[PDB]
């Protein structure tokens, strides 16, 4: 609750994060769980690779620990692996860096916790329900009695928004004005959109937070980028910077692939064995979280809009079905149900046609076939592909391509609403492919745009008196 | 798209059908599947009857083809069956007639496909979503460039409706004015309605398309039927025509009965073994598809109205109270749950409840009793809308009996609202009974009405300038 | 159908009750069942205690009637119990009083039947179905022919409402103006509300129907209560009356506690046995039925409003959930699904991973763990605005505290919206506690309010020309 002591963007961001992860205790536990998941993936994997004797486990009454090798031997068997030891050393260095960041992260969050309790007066018990609007009302009312900020200017409730969302408004405006290569023309497919978690991380590491970024303070743009002249040397410097960051990505490719290959397999293989159709459900597409997002919109407001409008969008995506597939389903159901009805009447009649060594199995198969076809056979209604279903999905999100409103029922509309709707299997595939795809897009497709990026940041960056250097659109 | 290359109706109907079966390819496949279903039913049945050695299959490790007899013997075993060979010859003649009609139909449908692509400019890809609306308005614009009709004003298409629906408006007006015997007074039941697929086929074969029908052209009524005189000789001729068509039906009775047998088996017996309650769901009743029809209404508009209004109608069939029972359920649940609670508290206390000769059986029977009663006990706070149910169903249908609106809750209303919405099982039964019932209704109940049918077709048949001879009501 | 034979209330109320219990035959049967439930509870209550030899039943093949003792001995064993014989004599006297009231009631309900059939012309078959408005539309039109009572007033169309609901409007206005102690401040809990069936019965027995009540006729207030003077002696007399009625309650406490014990114990426990979560569902309360009730509102209109608005209220009560647990669920699901995915991949790979010392149990326990966690994981995309919903509950219930509309999401709102909506189990507990709690509230908390009760009944009691003495608010 101190008198404007440390850079603001961070203080406010931390305050917001503490409100989101409902309370200090919850947040601390969440971070600890995040650290234990990494360590568990890595240690479980290195235990499966190195310590388990699969041959004895498989064939050659056996108790579970009959497989495992004693530690006095596991250490030697894992140590005589140069590749494994190297991956483990890099993994442990990343881990130690994350644990050290966590330490302070909590040493700096105890300060926000005391801020809440003593200056805002919202106990951690009343915080999951304290709500954002009131807190906003609390912080802005607190600004007076207790000194905070320069005091040159009193808070105005949009300052806090700019502080929390400075770099995110920049991402919104970058993606909105078609910088930042996302569209690609793949052979054998339409124009794909490839925007992942790692790619946006790299874009922010290149532009916003790094050793030689565009920003020096986290609230002020470096002095040269405001100058009209020397734009070409700045463009060359940015191009070289992004070249070398792309090369670091290309060199780290195997390790992130491993983790990506690994964590992912673990994450959904359970779900696959349970309900293989959970991966057929659709999610709201990182490109699409950035496209449908307003300028000064905190994460919880975007997500509230995005799930208020989720079931209309699933009703839309499921409303168009192939007639042909429908006809094939109907007739395959007829022929399979006919052969099965005959075989069922026989097994009912005598019961020794049952479990024909061949028949029983087919009966099931044929049963699987009839069930699949009946699932593909449409049932009555839901065929609208309506202007109206779109007319509600839009009412939620509020943005649509302008060539969508008329032809809501075509393959052009579905195909590029498809890109926003993101069925998950692809997400998981698209997050797997990002280790190997992000360096080459970063080296080839973005380096030509560096001279346009420089002109964006020079042209669209306003200095607002209290907040510093913010995007020009987010005003 | 040759100008006046044909009478308007056999062209417009085909165009409409091509829009419905979404595209030429789809339609072709659908027809092929329709031809393969007939051939499969007949060949599978004759294989089951004639080639399989059931004794070895049942009792006397055995592979499946150990049952089947070699073809060199199947041919002789199926050939030495006069009844089977005769049924197969009649079946093959009907099949060959259907295959020849199919070849002629696709040779005539390639012309409609070229019509679409070249004169309407709707590719087969944009046709499942082109929409009827698009083409119906569009052709009317084509009427200028690619001319049709020797002397044609741009098609209002109001007329075009007339072309597609000439004979169907006649059926609607026949059933609407209570010609065409449908109501019957069966002993042991109320007034049944018996209107099937075969019966309406026979009515149309008698009245509209045949060797000596009422119509000579498909768009013009024969010249004598417009004359007021000679009505009695025309009535006698129509009566003799329908007598002999009924006798042809009576002679073909065994074959159509056999057909309705096997197709259903395969079609339904599978569904019975899977979900015996799927046949308890209700369907919209061929009488009822003709009763709830609306002026000049293409099939897809009727079906859209009919399924928009399907779930309200199931909630209605579902809704009525049976109140006195409710009380019996409540109080039987009380007394049974009381005795069971005592016996349960005892078996929990000591666990030596058993050895009583009937105890355990008493607990099980009492549990069944409580569960049945609780199923009959209405759920509290379950809303009831008799007025609404007999209101929203009408809003979707738009036609109502004048004695339904007041007493929505009586057995008179349910009993005759049932016929319109009758359940699938009585549908399958009523389609089974039509081979044996259609000839006798056709001979006995319709031949007395021939003099009224003649007066209908003389009185209600207007000559509209562009379309020809249409029903007088459908104007 | 005669003229003014009985008090209008004693006629109109009966007419309304006959419409509610749909018909005379129903009403009778319901009353008979009500009489048989009392006698059945008391019977075994006494057969289980007195005639059954539990020792032989438990331990010392045995048929059920091997336990029971012969009647020649049951009579002596139940007769040599002074406490049991005394409870049975009091129970039999209450029963005989109820049976005599039942005979008198059906002898008076036949008259009413005849009223329906002959003067209203609504047969008992068309009654469950008559609908309320129609009777209203029938009785008021009948007032001309079979003249109604005095016939002083033609039907008011409100008069019937006042007649049926005279004392209930008084209860509504008493509870509405915070007479009638309901709120209590218990230690260890918030302000509890204790309003039961027995408490409201006692309030009505004290105020409305008794030997020395406020009312002498059932439609006229005693003459002294209209006088401004002598208010203090009337207050003292009312205080003494309620003191002695409270003392009668305190003396009858053991018997009502037992009966409350017996009648309740039997019913609910079995249900809990079946589904222990049925008692976690919530019901509207005697209170809350009196708080949310309009003035001249018949019981069926209140209950229609109350169940139209029941599911919104359950959605509200279930909306608040722990942030912390969620996190535990998510991460336990991760770790369990990870170990299970590994073990599943192994059992798929070789199939002999199974049959290992812990193999056929770890997979099952881990599957249960993942399923439990996934049930605790909230559905992502799940939209709950607690604040928004209360709006629909209000649209149905129609009454609310002012300080709810803003803070719909707080514990203050839930805590006192809890009182209106409390779950069954506290209902059954609160009906159990009323025998022992009603006398002390009646003696201590209401006797101080007697001088305010007298001033209420003097100030708010209007004489309306046709109906007599009605509450002043219910106008």
Short mmCIF file of C-alpha atoms in Angstrom, two decimals, chain C residues 100-466:
data_model
loop_
_atom_site.label_atom_id
_atom_site.label_comp_id
_atom_site.label_asym_id
_atom_site.label_seq_id
_atom_site.Cartn_x
_atom_site.Cartn_y
_atom_site.Cartn_z
CA UNK C 100 -67.01 -37.80 13.44
CA UNK C 101 -65.88 -34.60 11.74
CA UNK C 102 -65.33 -36.65 8.57
CA UNK C 103 -68.84 -38.10 8.58
CA UNK C 104 -70.32 -34.65 9.16
CA UNK C 105 -68.08 -33.27 6.41
CA UNK C 106 -69.18 -35.76 3.76
CA UNK C 107 -72.82 -35.29 4.73
CA UNK C 108 -72.25 -31.58 4.08
CA UNK C 109 -70.24 -32.22 0.88
CA UNK C 110 -73.00 -34.23 -0.76
CA UNK C 111 -75.09 -31.11 -0.59
CA UNK C 112 -72.35 -29.25 -2.34
CA UNK C 113 -72.06 -32.03 -4.94
CA UNK C 114 -75.67 -31.65 -5.70
CA UNK C 115 -75.02 -27.90 -5.98
CA UNK C 116 -72.50 -28.52 -8.76
CA UNK C 117 -74.55 -31.06 -10.69
CA UNK C 118 -77.92 -29.33 -10.47
CA UNK C 119 -77.23 -25.57 -10.22
CA UNK C 120 -73.77 -25.21 -11.79
CA UNK C 121 -74.28 -28.22 -14.11
CA UNK C 122 -70.64 -29.37 -13.96
CA UNK C 123 -70.57 -33.19 -13.69
CA UNK C 124 -67.86 -34.74 -11.56
CA UNK C 125 -66.32 -36.09 -14.77
CA UNK C 126 -65.83 -32.61 -16.24
CA UNK C 127 -64.54 -31.22 -12.94
CA UNK C 128 -60.90 -32.13 -12.62
CA UNK C 129 -61.24 -30.51 -15.88
CA UNK C 130 -63.64 -27.67 -15.22
CA UNK C 131 -60.84 -25.13 -14.71
CA UNK C 132 -61.12 -22.42 -12.12
CA UNK C 133 -62.39 -19.61 -14.21
CA UNK C 134 -65.35 -21.54 -15.48
CA UNK C 135 -66.75 -22.29 -12.08
CA UNK C 136 -66.26 -18.64 -11.36
CA UNK C 137 -68.08 -17.97 -14.53
CA UNK C 138 -70.73 -20.36 -13.45
CA UNK C 139 -71.37 -19.50 -9.80
CA UNK C 140 -71.67 -15.78 -10.53
CA UNK C 141 -74.11 -16.44 -13.38
CA UNK C 142 -76.06 -18.87 -11.18
CA UNK C 143 -76.51 -16.14 -8.55
CA UNK C 144 -79.52 -15.04 -10.61
CA UNK C 145 -81.43 -18.33 -10.85
CA UNK C 146 -80.64 -20.29 -7.73
CA UNK C 147 -80.24 -17.12 -5.68
CA UNK C 148 -77.00 -16.93 -3.69
CA UNK C 149 -77.40 -16.86 0.05
CA UNK C 150 -78.85 -13.59 1.14
CA UNK C 151 -78.41 -12.51 -2.46
CA UNK C 152 -77.86 -9.15 -0.84
CA UNK C 153 -75.01 -8.61 -3.21
CA UNK C 154 -74.85 -10.05 -6.68
CA UNK C 155 -71.61 -11.84 -6.80
CA UNK C 156 -68.91 -9.28 -6.20
CA UNK C 157 -66.42 -11.38 -8.14
CA UNK C 158 -64.35 -10.43 -5.13
CA UNK C 159 -66.91 -11.40 -2.54
CA UNK C 160 -66.20 -15.09 -3.16
CA UNK C 161 -62.49 -14.36 -2.69
CA UNK C 162 -63.06 -12.58 0.63
CA UNK C 163 -65.32 -15.41 1.82
CA UNK C 164 -62.76 -18.13 1.07
CA UNK C 165 -59.75 -16.11 2.25
CA UNK C 166 -60.94 -13.99 5.20
CA UNK C 167 -58.62 -15.46 7.83
CA UNK C 168 -55.78 -16.05 5.37
CA UNK C 169 -55.69 -12.39 4.41
CA UNK C 170 -55.40 -11.70 8.14
CA UNK C 171 -52.43 -14.05 8.40
CA UNK C 172 -50.84 -12.44 5.35
CA UNK C 173 -51.23 -8.97 6.87
CA UNK C 174 -50.04 -10.11 10.31
CA UNK C 175 -46.84 -11.65 8.93
CA UNK C 176 -46.43 -8.73 6.51
CA UNK C 177 -46.40 -6.11 9.28
CA UNK C 178 -44.02 -8.05 11.53
CA UNK C 179 -46.42 -8.99 14.28
CA UNK C 180 -46.40 -12.69 15.01
CA UNK C 181 -42.84 -13.50 16.21
CA UNK C 182 -40.91 -15.38 13.52
CA UNK C 183 -37.34 -14.02 13.67
CA UNK C 184 -35.18 -15.35 16.47
CA UNK C 185 -31.54 -14.69 17.34
CA UNK C 186 -29.96 -18.04 18.08
CA UNK C 187 -26.41 -18.20 19.46
CA UNK C 188 -24.01 -19.78 17.00
CA UNK C 189 -26.30 -18.97 14.07
CA UNK C 190 -27.81 -15.98 12.32
CA UNK C 191 -31.36 -14.82 12.85
CA UNK C 192 -33.36 -18.00 12.38
CA UNK C 193 -36.96 -18.02 11.18
CA UNK C 194 -39.18 -20.56 12.92
CA UNK C 195 -42.62 -20.74 11.29
CA UNK C 196 -44.20 -24.19 11.20
CA UNK C 197 -47.54 -25.89 10.63
CA UNK C 198 -48.30 -26.24 14.35
CA UNK C 199 -47.32 -22.66 15.14
CA UNK C 200 -49.64 -21.19 12.50
CA UNK C 201 -52.37 -23.56 13.66
CA UNK C 202 -51.97 -22.20 17.19
CA UNK C 203 -52.02 -18.61 15.94
CA UNK C 204 -55.30 -19.23 14.11
CA UNK C 205 -56.79 -21.13 17.05
CA UNK C 206 -55.91 -18.17 19.27
CA UNK C 207 -57.10 -15.41 16.97
CA UNK C 208 -59.85 -16.71 14.70
CA UNK C 209 -61.66 -19.99 15.53
CA UNK C 210 -62.15 -20.96 19.14
CA UNK C 211 -64.32 -20.54 22.21
CA UNK C 212 -63.29 -16.97 23.00
CA UNK C 213 -61.57 -15.78 19.84
CA UNK C 214 -61.63 -12.34 18.27
CA UNK C 215 -64.48 -13.47 16.00
CA UNK C 216 -67.93 -14.66 17.09
CA UNK C 217 -69.60 -15.55 13.77
CA UNK C 218 -66.74 -16.43 11.36
CA UNK C 219 -67.74 -13.26 9.47
CA UNK C 220 -68.06 -10.63 12.22
CA UNK C 221 -65.63 -9.27 14.81
CA UNK C 222 -66.81 -9.18 18.41
CA UNK C 223 -68.27 -5.81 19.31
CA UNK C 224 -65.74 -4.70 21.92
CA UNK C 225 -62.70 -4.98 19.65
CA UNK C 226 -64.08 -2.21 17.46
CA UNK C 227 -64.08 0.16 20.45
CA UNK C 228 -61.08 2.41 21.01
CA UNK C 229 -61.47 2.43 24.77
CA UNK C 230 -61.02 -0.59 27.06
CA UNK C 231 -58.04 -1.64 24.93
CA UNK C 232 -55.94 -2.48 27.99
CA UNK C 233 -58.41 -4.90 29.57
CA UNK C 234 -58.87 -6.56 26.18
CA UNK C 235 -55.09 -6.86 25.89
CA UNK C 236 -54.91 -8.47 29.33
CA UNK C 237 -57.69 -10.90 28.42
CA UNK C 238 -55.96 -11.83 25.15
CA UNK C 239 -52.66 -12.29 27.00
CA UNK C 240 -54.30 -14.65 29.50
CA UNK C 241 -56.01 -16.57 26.69
CA UNK C 242 -52.74 -17.08 24.84
CA UNK C 243 -51.00 -17.98 28.10
CA UNK C 244 -53.44 -20.82 28.72
CA UNK C 245 -53.36 -22.00 25.10
CA UNK C 246 -49.57 -22.06 25.33
CA UNK C 247 -49.83 -24.10 28.53
CA UNK C 248 -52.15 -26.58 26.81
CA UNK C 249 -49.49 -26.83 24.09
CA UNK C 250 -46.78 -27.41 26.69
CA UNK C 251 -48.83 -30.19 28.29
CA UNK C 252 -49.59 -31.84 24.93
CA UNK C 253 -45.91 -31.58 23.96
CA UNK C 254 -45.00 -35.27 24.57
CA UNK C 255 -47.84 -36.65 22.44
CA UNK C 256 -47.28 -34.39 19.43
CA UNK C 257 -43.55 -35.05 19.73
CA UNK C 258 -44.21 -38.80 19.57
CA UNK C 259 -46.63 -38.47 16.71
CA UNK C 260 -44.29 -36.16 15.06
CA UNK C 261 -41.73 -38.82 15.87
CA UNK C 262 -43.71 -41.71 14.51
CA UNK C 263 -45.27 -40.22 11.41
CA UNK C 264 -42.09 -38.65 10.26
CA UNK C 265 -39.69 -41.34 11.13
CA UNK C 266 -41.43 -43.82 8.95
CA UNK C 267 -41.71 -41.72 5.87
CA UNK C 268 -38.50 -39.89 5.34
CA UNK C 269 -35.89 -42.41 6.45
CA UNK C 270 -36.73 -44.94 3.79
CA UNK C 271 -36.41 -42.23 1.24
CA UNK C 272 -33.03 -41.34 2.57
CA UNK C 273 -32.16 -44.96 2.38
CA UNK C 274 -33.13 -44.90 -1.27
CA UNK C 275 -31.70 -41.48 -2.23
CA UNK C 276 -30.01 -39.61 0.63
CA UNK C 277 -29.77 -36.54 -1.61
CA UNK C 278 -33.51 -36.10 -2.00
CA UNK C 279 -33.45 -34.40 1.41
CA UNK C 280 -30.84 -31.99 0.05
CA UNK C 281 -33.36 -30.59 -2.41
CA UNK C 282 -35.08 -27.43 -1.27
CA UNK C 283 -38.74 -26.59 -0.68
CA UNK C 284 -40.52 -23.25 -0.29
CA UNK C 285 -41.42 -23.31 3.54
CA UNK C 286 -44.57 -22.40 5.39
CA UNK C 287 -42.89 -19.08 5.63
CA UNK C 288 -42.20 -17.71 2.30
CA UNK C 289 -45.49 -19.23 1.29
CA UNK C 290 -46.88 -16.50 3.55
CA UNK C 291 -44.30 -13.88 2.59
CA UNK C 292 -44.53 -14.23 -1.21
CA UNK C 293 -48.33 -14.52 -1.21
CA UNK C 294 -50.55 -11.75 -2.58
CA UNK C 295 -53.59 -10.71 -0.57
CA UNK C 296 -56.61 -12.32 -2.30
CA UNK C 297 -54.73 -15.26 -3.75
CA UNK C 298 -56.23 -18.71 -3.68
CA UNK C 299 -53.92 -21.57 -2.85
CA UNK C 300 -53.61 -22.86 -6.41
CA UNK C 301 -52.52 -19.47 -7.76
CA UNK C 302 -49.78 -19.17 -5.15
CA UNK C 303 -48.59 -22.70 -5.84
CA UNK C 304 -48.61 -22.13 -9.60
CA UNK C 305 -46.41 -19.06 -9.07
CA UNK C 306 -44.23 -21.00 -6.64
CA UNK C 307 -43.41 -23.88 -8.95
CA UNK C 308 -43.17 -21.82 -12.08
CA UNK C 309 -40.33 -20.19 -10.14
CA UNK C 310 -38.72 -23.25 -8.54
CA UNK C 311 -36.01 -24.28 -11.01
CA UNK C 312 -34.59 -20.74 -11.34
CA UNK C 313 -34.31 -20.72 -7.56
CA UNK C 314 -32.50 -24.06 -7.46
CA UNK C 315 -30.11 -22.80 -10.14
CA UNK C 316 -29.46 -19.79 -7.91
CA UNK C 317 -28.92 -21.78 -4.73
CA UNK C 318 -26.47 -24.13 -6.44
CA UNK C 319 -24.35 -21.38 -8.15
CA UNK C 320 -21.49 -20.69 -5.68
CA UNK C 321 -18.49 -23.04 -5.62
CA UNK C 322 -15.01 -23.19 -4.09
CA UNK C 323 -12.21 -21.87 -6.11
CA UNK C 324 -9.65 -23.94 -4.24
CA UNK C 325 -11.20 -27.31 -4.62
CA UNK C 326 -11.43 -26.83 -8.32
CA UNK C 327 -7.73 -26.54 -8.47
CA UNK C 328 -7.26 -29.72 -6.44
CA UNK C 329 -9.62 -31.50 -8.85
CA UNK C 330 -7.79 -30.26 -11.95
CA UNK C 331 -4.38 -31.28 -10.67
CA UNK C 332 -5.43 -34.61 -9.19
CA UNK C 333 -7.02 -35.37 -12.55
CA UNK C 334 -3.74 -34.47 -14.26
CA UNK C 335 -1.54 -36.69 -12.11
CA UNK C 336 -3.98 -39.62 -12.03
CA UNK C 337 -4.69 -39.46 -15.76
CA UNK C 338 -0.95 -39.35 -16.41
CA UNK C 339 -0.19 -42.50 -14.41
CA UNK C 340 -3.25 -44.18 -15.91
CA UNK C 341 -2.28 -43.21 -19.47
CA UNK C 342 1.12 -44.79 -18.93
CA UNK C 343 -0.38 -47.97 -17.47
CA UNK C 344 -3.02 -48.11 -20.23
CA UNK C 345 -0.41 -47.72 -22.96
CA UNK C 346 1.49 -50.59 -21.38
CA UNK C 347 -1.54 -52.89 -21.09
CA UNK C 348 -2.42 -52.08 -24.71
CA UNK C 349 1.13 -52.72 -25.90
CA UNK C 350 1.75 -56.18 -24.47
CA UNK C 351 -1.56 -57.17 -22.70
CA UNK C 352 0.46 -59.03 -20.03
CA UNK C 353 1.05 -55.81 -18.10
CA UNK C 354 -2.14 -57.03 -16.47
CA UNK C 355 -1.91 -59.91 -14.00
CA UNK C 356 0.81 -58.19 -12.04
CA UNK C 357 0.53 -58.02 -8.29
CA UNK C 358 -1.21 -54.63 -8.18
CA UNK C 359 -2.46 -54.62 -11.79
CA UNK C 360 -6.18 -55.26 -11.70
CA UNK C 361 -6.84 -52.68 -9.02
CA UNK C 362 -4.66 -49.63 -9.67
CA UNK C 363 -6.29 -49.02 -13.06
CA UNK C 364 -9.76 -49.28 -11.51
CA UNK C 365 -8.97 -46.99 -8.57
CA UNK C 366 -7.30 -44.47 -10.87
CA UNK C 367 -10.32 -44.51 -13.16
CA UNK C 368 -12.58 -43.78 -10.20
CA UNK C 369 -10.24 -40.97 -9.13
CA UNK C 370 -10.20 -39.36 -12.58
CA UNK C 371 -13.99 -39.61 -12.80
CA UNK C 372 -14.53 -38.02 -9.38
CA UNK C 373 -12.11 -35.19 -10.17
CA UNK C 374 -13.66 -34.58 -13.60
CA UNK C 375 -17.02 -34.36 -11.85
CA UNK C 376 -15.59 -31.72 -9.52
CA UNK C 377 -13.88 -29.84 -12.37
CA UNK C 378 -16.38 -27.16 -13.42
CA UNK C 379 -17.45 -27.18 -17.02
CA UNK C 380 -15.34 -24.66 -18.87
CA UNK C 381 -17.51 -22.34 -20.95
CA UNK C 382 -20.13 -22.65 -18.24
CA UNK C 383 -21.92 -19.43 -17.92
CA UNK C 384 -23.17 -18.34 -14.63
CA UNK C 385 -24.02 -14.86 -13.75
CA UNK C 386 -25.39 -15.15 -10.26
CA UNK C 387 -26.38 -11.55 -10.42
CA UNK C 388 -28.43 -11.85 -13.55
CA UNK C 389 -30.58 -14.86 -12.58
CA UNK C 390 -32.32 -13.60 -9.47
CA UNK C 391 -34.12 -11.52 -12.05
CA UNK C 392 -36.09 -14.49 -13.39
CA UNK C 393 -36.83 -15.81 -9.89
CA UNK C 394 -38.29 -12.39 -9.11
CA UNK C 395 -40.28 -12.39 -12.35
CA UNK C 396 -42.02 -15.47 -11.05
CA UNK C 397 -42.15 -14.96 -7.26
CA UNK C 398 -43.04 -11.22 -7.62
CA UNK C 399 -41.75 -10.07 -4.20
CA UNK C 400 -38.30 -9.23 -2.83
CA UNK C 401 -36.19 -7.48 -0.21
CA UNK C 402 -34.85 -4.20 -1.60
CA UNK C 403 -31.27 -4.97 -0.70
CA UNK C 404 -31.14 -8.05 -2.94
CA UNK C 405 -31.30 -6.48 -6.39
CA UNK C 406 -27.87 -4.99 -6.31
CA UNK C 407 -25.79 -7.59 -4.46
CA UNK C 408 -27.20 -10.84 -5.81
CA UNK C 409 -23.89 -12.63 -5.29
CA UNK C 410 -23.13 -12.00 -1.62
CA UNK C 411 -23.56 -14.20 1.44
CA UNK C 412 -26.12 -11.78 2.88
CA UNK C 413 -28.40 -12.38 -0.12
CA UNK C 414 -27.92 -16.09 -0.24
CA UNK C 415 -28.37 -16.39 3.52
CA UNK C 416 -31.77 -14.73 3.61
CA UNK C 417 -32.87 -16.07 0.26
CA UNK C 418 -31.96 -19.31 1.91
CA UNK C 419 -34.80 -18.81 4.41
CA UNK C 420 -37.43 -18.50 1.72
CA UNK C 421 -35.96 -21.53 -0.08
CA UNK C 422 -34.79 -23.98 2.58
CA UNK C 423 -33.96 -27.57 1.84
CA UNK C 424 -36.13 -30.38 2.97
CA UNK C 425 -33.98 -31.66 5.71
CA UNK C 426 -34.23 -28.51 7.80
CA UNK C 427 -37.96 -28.62 7.06
CA UNK C 428 -38.28 -32.10 8.58
CA UNK C 429 -36.06 -31.03 11.50
CA UNK C 430 -38.08 -27.85 12.00
CA UNK C 431 -41.35 -29.79 12.01
CA UNK C 432 -39.85 -32.17 14.58
CA UNK C 433 -38.76 -29.33 16.85
CA UNK C 434 -42.13 -27.56 16.79
CA UNK C 435 -43.83 -29.64 19.54
CA UNK C 436 -41.10 -28.58 22.00
CA UNK C 437 -40.55 -25.05 20.65
CA UNK C 438 -44.09 -23.80 19.95
CA UNK C 439 -45.27 -23.56 23.59
CA UNK C 440 -42.30 -21.45 24.69
CA UNK C 441 -42.49 -19.04 21.77
CA UNK C 442 -46.25 -18.89 22.34
CA UNK C 443 -45.85 -18.10 26.06
CA UNK C 444 -42.86 -15.75 25.91
CA UNK C 445 -42.57 -14.06 22.52
CA UNK C 446 -46.21 -13.48 21.58
CA UNK C 447 -47.83 -12.50 24.90
CA UNK C 448 -45.89 -9.19 24.91
CA UNK C 449 -47.34 -8.43 21.52
CA UNK C 450 -50.97 -8.82 22.56
CA UNK C 451 -51.50 -5.07 22.93
CA UNK C 452 -50.23 -4.58 19.38
CA UNK C 453 -52.39 -7.43 18.10
CA UNK C 454 -55.48 -5.82 19.64
CA UNK C 455 -54.59 -2.51 17.98
CA UNK C 456 -54.08 -4.25 14.64
CA UNK C 457 -57.49 -5.92 14.74
CA UNK C 458 -59.15 -2.71 15.88
CA UNK C 459 -57.41 -0.52 13.31
CA UNK C 460 -57.32 -2.84 10.28
CA UNK C 461 -60.77 -4.42 10.03
CA UNK C 462 -63.25 -2.94 7.56
CA UNK C 463 -66.94 -3.83 7.34
CA UNK C 464 -67.75 -4.43 3.67
CA UNK C 465 -71.47 -4.47 2.95
CA UNK C 466 -71.90 -7.96 1.51
#
